[PDB]
A paper describes a structure:
CNG channels open when bound with [name] and conduct Na+ and Ca2+ ions into photoreceptor cells. R421W disrupts this interaction, destabilizes the closed state, and stabilizes the open state.
Given that the R421W mutation appears to greatly attenuate [name] activation of [name], we at first hypothesized that either [name]_R421W could not bind [name] or [name]-bound [name]_R421W would be closed due to mutation-induced defective coupling of [name] binding and gate opening. To our surprise, [name]-bound [name]_R421W is open and its structure (determined at 2.9 Å resolution with C4 symmetry) is identical to the previously reported structure of [name]-bound WT [name]-425. The hydrophobic cavity gate formed by F403 and V407 of S6 opens to the same extent in the mutant channel as in the WT channel, and the CNBD and gating ring in both channels have the same ligand-bound conformation. These results suggest that the R421W mutation does not markedly affect the process of [name] activation of [name].
Residue numbers in the entry:
A (entry chain D): 292 to 586
B (entry chain A): 101 to 620
C (entry chain B): 292 to 438
Amino acid sequence: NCLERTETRSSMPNAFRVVVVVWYIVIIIHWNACLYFWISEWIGLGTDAWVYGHLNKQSLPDDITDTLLRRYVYSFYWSTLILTTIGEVPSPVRNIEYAFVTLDLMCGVLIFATIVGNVGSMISNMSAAWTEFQNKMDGIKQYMELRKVSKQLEIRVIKWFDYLWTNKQSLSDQQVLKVLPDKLQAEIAMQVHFETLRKVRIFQDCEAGLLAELVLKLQLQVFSPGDFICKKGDIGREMYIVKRGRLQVVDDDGKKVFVTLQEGSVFGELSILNIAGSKNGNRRTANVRSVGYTD
Amino acid sequence: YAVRIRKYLANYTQDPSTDNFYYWTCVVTVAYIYNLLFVIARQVFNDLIGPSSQSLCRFYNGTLNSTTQVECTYNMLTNMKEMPTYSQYPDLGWSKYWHFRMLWVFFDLLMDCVYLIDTFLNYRMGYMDQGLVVREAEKVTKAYWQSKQYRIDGISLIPLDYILGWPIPYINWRGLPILRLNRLIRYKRVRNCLERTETRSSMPNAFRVVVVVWYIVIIIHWNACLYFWISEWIGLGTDAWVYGHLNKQSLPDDITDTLLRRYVYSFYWSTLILTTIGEVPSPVRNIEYAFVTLDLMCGVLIFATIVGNVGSMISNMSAAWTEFQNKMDGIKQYMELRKVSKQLEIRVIKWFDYLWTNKQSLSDQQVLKVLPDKLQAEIAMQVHFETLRKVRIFQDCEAGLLAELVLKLQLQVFSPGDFICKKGDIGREMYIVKRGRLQVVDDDGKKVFVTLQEGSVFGELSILNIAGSKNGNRRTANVRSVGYTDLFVLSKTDLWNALREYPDARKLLLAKGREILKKD
Amino acid sequence: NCLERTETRSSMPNAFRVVVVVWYIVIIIHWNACLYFWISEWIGLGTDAWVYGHLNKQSLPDDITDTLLRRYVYSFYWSTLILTTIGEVPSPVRNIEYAFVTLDLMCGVLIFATIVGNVGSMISNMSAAWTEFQNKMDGIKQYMELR
Ligand SMILES: Nc1nc2c(ncn2[C@@H]2O[C@@H]3COP(=O)(O)O[C@H]3[C@H]2O)c(=O)[nH]1
Ligand SMILES: Nc1nc2c(ncn2[C@@H]2O[C@@H]3COP(=O)(O)O[C@H]3[C@H]2O)c(=O)[nH]1
């Protein structure tokens, strides 16, 4: 329960996981070192070439003193070679040493395969976001290589992915969306976007229940520079609140700018609000265009 | 031109999103790889700048019949009974290895000039403010001073190796080339260069295996330098684990002790230890046991991580074929369990052969659940431009209808002889021909009225609501695929959404539908 | 395209996959056997204890005749121990043999890790339905044991 509560509370969880599995490895090799030296001193030291002693010649070579440190150091090395199944140790002689080495090598195979599979998974999940990102971009790039898509649009997609990795604006709200409760989700989302949603006039000139209702139905979408978010011929099913970026309300020539849109601006609502006073209705009434990258 | 260079560098400001900056990050990656490999190699294998000491082998002379401590030949470094002693040069080898040392200090000054241009570009680095880079000098210099990048660049450019990293003969300073690990501190530019190179690459898995082969070579090289540093710190030839004459794997019979032999045996020892093959001599002293136990466990953990990443990388080179064959294994096991007819089994197998031969699998899931709908619609109108230029409901009307409907079209592949529509069935969909040829036939299947080619529109009579004829929701004709046919399927709901929003396409569709219904 | 169309049309797909990867293994060990014996005869046979010859004593022990079958059999065994990184072969002597054995052992590590990972996935997917079934039943049984 202490290790589970420490992995829960940790700000560095994968570092704690590799420290715990290194401790597990050291405890297992230490216990097998003690088993090897107990079987060596139970058989009798120096009685054959597998047991620790003078006949071993890996344990006690020339100009090497038999000390307690030498006993623990050779037993830890023997267990490191046996449990990792390198096996560069002397062969067993008696049948009880064959039985112990066969059982201990198969225990080493099974539990060290389990352990380093967990280690490989742990240092694989230190880069799971970059792996999922590059699997998505490999899918997009293979689709664009198969379908003979234009090179301008290919470098537009590649620069969009470069902006999403450089600014870390990938869709990370799936985690809070399918794990956390909506009272904690709304509190986190009003915590993060507080400086953005403090600039919104439909939220700050009205009741807080509207923002508490709408803050989970807002989706973050990243647009390229020069992208037309709205133009007059298109129909509108959505409104947009500016999280980041600068926009410009332009004409059909794209030169004359009427008004710019900064962070916290509200646009795109004229198409989805139903006013019978003008000729458009569901149509967009203006051409907005992203200056840079725009969330 | 001094005022030209001076004022150009005075209000220069770097855009980090350019391709030229990415090539500069590749140059900084080259300088970092230099610093990594050759700084640990010049610290450990100190004959890389010149030996700086005279090797003195004992030699039984054939003329004077006595042993002398003369300088070693390559014949005297072969089959040694003891390792040579190293008498120090008076000038520390500067009189005869100055060309090697000036080549090394030229490449050191070259990579330090690369680091100086890199920290000047850091000093004038533009930064995103509202999706645009700031590119006047005052804001980018104050953002540089606010961000402690001056601390990271100033630790990384301390020239301590230019005073203490070279053999000085006057104070008999041996040299310390390990003082460029501060140049190894600048890892973040290298990591961003590798991430931007994997982003921009047309061959991503080849770049991934090249990067992990470079990681493997750097790790085995650093462990080679650790093994030879521990071998020369214990003392060479003192036992059978350390490099030397007592090892007999390092120096066998008729093998000369050279610097190439030292690096080659250390690289081989680290290759066998980190991959845990272990066909190397056993340790003798307790410090060698501790180093080999720690280094073998580091080899187990980090090489298990590395080759697991390698196996995943060369597994994802065929992930589409693996997913395809997992789906077909599911279909084949379902058909083997359920005793389905052999004609229908070979029809399903030939359908899968057509989807792999023509690569018409559902690949729009990727753009569907990653990309924005403005980029999705631009890609889909880029790919199917020659098909949707032939469509009369799209090219005789407004472009907003095609921009609305181009994401609601689904590609479905039909077998030859398949009946896409026949008169008894009800219709919930319309079809636009992406590829293939079709035929409007009778109930006998022999008499053909009209053929349908690429860009033809059919299937709309059932889902358009005309009260002028007896059918209504029924199909009015029997269409039949001649060969394999890709079709742009569109639902009744999505069509009637785009037709309630766009009235002129509704007028043309109901006009030509009532025209073909009233001659029919 | 023949191997892809054969894996498509097969009623036993996993048996065909393990036959194809056993053929891949045999072709790779055969090509490395030919590389080892070409480097052995280019260095010169019997010149040291790593090269095939009389000084090797694993290649030509006592009462073992030097034949063409012995050359191919020892080269196939050497490549089987090197590519699977068991390594119970004589150590290199000259620097070119160290370079070849280091490169060939790292090629063995990478491409045989790829190959047996594919083999383990192939004989894991022979029982994927029973594994998914027992993962579902383990979930139901753990929910019923907890509740
Ligand atoms: N027509 C018009 N639209 C504006 C102006 N300023 C901001 N907009 C916004 O631009 C949006 C474009 O799409 P909508 O027509 O849905 O809604 C429009 C308004 O929200 C303006 O001055 N004139
Ligand atoms: N009835 C009829 N249908 C045709 C003819 N030419 C093309 N079709 C198409 O065949 C389609 C079959 O399904 P639908 O009845 O939905 O719509 C029909 C028309 O779209 C024709 O000449 N007569």
